[PDB]
Amino acid sequence: VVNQNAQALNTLVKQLSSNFGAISSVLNDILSRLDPPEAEVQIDRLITG
Amino acid sequence: QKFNGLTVLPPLLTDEMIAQYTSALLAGTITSGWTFGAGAALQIPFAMQ
Amino acid sequence: LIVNNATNVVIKVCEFQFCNDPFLGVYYHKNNKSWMESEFRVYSSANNCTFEYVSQPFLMDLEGKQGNFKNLREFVFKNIDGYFKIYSKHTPINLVRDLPQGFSALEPLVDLPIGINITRFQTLLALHRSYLTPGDSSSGWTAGAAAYYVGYLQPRTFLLKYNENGTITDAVDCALDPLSETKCTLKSFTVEKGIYQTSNFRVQPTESIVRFPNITNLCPFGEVFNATRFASVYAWNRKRISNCVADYSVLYNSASFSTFKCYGVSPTKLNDLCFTNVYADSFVIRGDEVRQIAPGQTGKIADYNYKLPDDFTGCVIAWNSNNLDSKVGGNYNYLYRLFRKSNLKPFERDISTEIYQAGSTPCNGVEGFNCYFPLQSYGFQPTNGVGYQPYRVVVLSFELLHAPATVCGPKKSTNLVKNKCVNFNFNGLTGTGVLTESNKKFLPFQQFGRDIADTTDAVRDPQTLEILDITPCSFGGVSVITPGTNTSNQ
Numbered sequence: 264v265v266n267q268n269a270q271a272l273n274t275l276v277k278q279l280s281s282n283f284g285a286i287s288s289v290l291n292d293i294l295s296r297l298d299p300p301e302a303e304v305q306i307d308r309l310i311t312g
Numbered sequence: 313q314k315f316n317g318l319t320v321l322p323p324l325l326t327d328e329m330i331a332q333y334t335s336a337l338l339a340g341t342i343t344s345g346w347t348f349g350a351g352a353a354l355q356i357p358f359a360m361q
Numbered sequence: 362l363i364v365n366n367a368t369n370v371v372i373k374v375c376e377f378q379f380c381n382d383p384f385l386g387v388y389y390h391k392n393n394k395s396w397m398e399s400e401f402r403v404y405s406s407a408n409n410c411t412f413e414y415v416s417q418p419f420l421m422d423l424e425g426k427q428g429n430f431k432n433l434r435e436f437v438f439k440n441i442d443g444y445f446k447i448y449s450k451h452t453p454i455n456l457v458r459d460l461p462q463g464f465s466a467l468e469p470l471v472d473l474p475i476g477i478n479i480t481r482f483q484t485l486l487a488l489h490r491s492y493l494t495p496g497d498s499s500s501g502w503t504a505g506a507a508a509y510y511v512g513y514l515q516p517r518t519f520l521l522k523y524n525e526n527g528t529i530t531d532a533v534d535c536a537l538d539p540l541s542e543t544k545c546t547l548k549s550f551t552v553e554k555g556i557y558q559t560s561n562f563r564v565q566p567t568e569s570i571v572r573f574p575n576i577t578n579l580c581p582f583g584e585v586f587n588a589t590r591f592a593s594v595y596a597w598n599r600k601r602i603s604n605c606v607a608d609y610s611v612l613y614n615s616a617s618f619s620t621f622k623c624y625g626v627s628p629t630k631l632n633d634l635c636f637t638n639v640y641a642d643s644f645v646i647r648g649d650e651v652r653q654i655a656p657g658q659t660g661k662i663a664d665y666n667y668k669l670p671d672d673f674t675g676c677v678i679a680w681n682s683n684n685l686d687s688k689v690g691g692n693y694n695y696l697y698r699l700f701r702k703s704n705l706k707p708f709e710r711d712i713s714t715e716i717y718q719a720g721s722t723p724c725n726g727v728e729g730f731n732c733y734f735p736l737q738s739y740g741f742q743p744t745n746g747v748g749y750q751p752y753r754v755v756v757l758s759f760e761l762l763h764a765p766a767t768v769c770g771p772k773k774s775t776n777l778v779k780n781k782c783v784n785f786n787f788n789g790l791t792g793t794g795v796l797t798e799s800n801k802k803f804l805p806f807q808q809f810g811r812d813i814a815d816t817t818d819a820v821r822d823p824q825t826l827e828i829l830d831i832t833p834c835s836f837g838g839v840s841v842i843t844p845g846t847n848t849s850n851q
């Protein structure tokens with residue numbers, strides 16, 4: 264019963280490095296390189312995932 | 313682990329107070345039999361229990 | 362200018378010439394008892410008007426008294442998107458000057474749609490000139506007694522309380538005190554004794570710092586822009602640009618550009634991020650083939666010629682050449698491929714001169730029927746159309762955080778700050794945290810550190826060359842415990 268919680272927590276951890284058909288996994292890297300109107304298509308695609 | 317916002321709250325009871333309850337429950341069968349959870353405790357030697 | 366006279370309220374939107382001290386003043390003469398305006402020192406001239414209005418009459422008396430006031434005109438002036446909104450209320454009083462503690466709501470008066478911009482305001486007032494006083498502009502002016510309050514409105518969220526007639530009867534804050542945030546959180550004014558969770562608070566940033574790598578060299582751009590010869594599209598030249606600041610604001614005075622397009626990157630952050638592996642690909646094509654350069658767009662110069670990748674993230678700059686790459690017979694130095702057994706792949710170049718094979722009849726130098734040469738001359742002349750003139754296209758392809766920093770921005774480093782949760786930038790990598798001194802050592806080549814989350818937690822300074830750990834200061838939340846709204850407010 265501890266194994267299931269610790270496994271599921273590592274499962275949510277690994278999802279932070281998935282794209283969902285995006286170009287990067289760190290929101291500040293998208294904000295540092297492209298104005299917000301030219302970044303909403305990546306941000307909504309990270310948000311839904 | 314806390315950087316991504318995974319907070320673990322500690323249980324309401326410690327193991328010392330839980331062990332105080334298990335010690336009361338163990339003492340009640342060795343001293344009063346079964347007539348202490350339905351009423352007020354009543355002594356009785358173990359040879360008749 | 363919205364002024365209430367002794368006739369009506371006058372609303373004029375003109376270009377007035379305001380005084381050094383504009384005000385009003387009415388006179389009480391001895392041939393009348395009426396207080397008309399005689400000191401109308403408001404504007405010097407009213408020229409170039411765009412709006413004038415008519416309002417309901419508000420006759421006044423204007424007889425100075427020092428007694429207690431028994432009415433209150435509270436207005437709130439807002440200008441959202443040009444429209445000016447006024448929220449008026451009239452409330453009588455009887456107390457000595459102070460704002461009563463009662464609860465009144467303000468109803469909206471009018472919404473003037475004018476779309477001017479307002480930055481300064483001045484309150485228009487009035488004066489008393491009588492024969493009890495000198496009546497002049499030195500010792501004749503008398504201000505009576507008056508007191509008005511001016512308060513700036515700030516972004517705030519209130520849980521409103523609506524009764525059975527529709528009015529607002531109580532306003533409870535969401536930020537003034539923890540108790541008001543709890544009471545607006547549950548959407549109720551009655552809270553029981555127990556623990557409740559509100560918003561969660563973290564530590565805020567304090568400072569920000571720069572630790573860029575210092576490089577004095579400036580990149581070569583003499584031939585990357587205006588020059589005396591450029592490469593053919595058949596065989597396009599790649600130049601390796603490294604160890605120098607790469608700027609783009611300074612590139613507007615070498616050649617006049619007719620296409621400044623950067624795909625994948627804002628054209629105002631090229632100098633804000635340090636680069637890696639900058640590849641300059643310059644070649645001349647025809648001006649009616651500028652549409653054929655594009656990521657994921659086919660063509661003839663995207664199939665049989667150099668094809669851009671379909672993930673390319675870089676900038677494409679190309680400009681018209683009038684007669685530098687053009688001849689009076691036509692320019693035949695620049696050639697293009699017109700037949701291919703298999704189209705070209707990203708970053709592929711052709712060096713074959715074979716004759717292309719069409720049909721059964723073989724070719725590649727056994728010239729004959731259906732043996733065409735794919736490499737055709739462009740034929741640039743100045744007498745041709747402008748879509749038929751040479752364009753020097755320079756494509757800049759670069760990486761971001763794929764290898765140690767080689768090409769960096771012109772912004773320079775700042776002071777080294779430690780033991781604080783501050784915003785940092787290293788080569789381009791941004792964060793917010795406390796930079797602590799580390800005791801884990803990498804091997805010399807390794808310049809980053811990750812965990813099981815795959816997030817940075819150890820960086821190497823390009824300046825001081827010391828391993829520094831990164832520790833977020835974000836932690837915990839805020840919970841509150843109440844002994845019930847009945848008992849008390851602690």
Ligand SMILES: *[C@@H]1O[C@H](CO)[C@@H](O)[C@H](O)[C@H]1NC(C)=O
Nearest residue numbers: 378379380381382383402405
């Ligand atoms: C007096 O009024 C004139 C015109 O408004 C102005 O130019 C001048 O500066 C004023 N002087 C004082 C004392 O403010």
Ligand SMILES: *[C@@H]1O[C@H](CO)[C@@H](O)[C@H](O)[C@H]1NC(C)=O
Nearest residue numbers: 375376377406407408409410
């Ligand atoms: C008033 O408007 C006219 C027409 O636009 C202009 O020629 C004149 O200079 C303006 N006068 C001002 C700015 O007071």
Ligand SMILES: *[C@@H]1O[C@H](CO)[C@@H](O)[C@H](O)[C@H]1NC(C)=O
Nearest residue numbers: 523524525526527528529530
């Ligand atoms: C609403 O206004 C009416 C009219 O004065 C008043 O009688 C009533 O008390 C008010 N509110 C209600 C519905 O109790």
Ligand SMILES: *[C@@H]1O[C@H](CO)[C@@H](O)[C@H](O)[C@H]1NC(C)=O
Nearest residue numbers: 550551552845846847848849
């Ligand atoms: C507060 O508690 C007292 C005692 O139980 C009760 O009489 C009173 O009505 C309560 N008031 C509120 C606001 O609940």
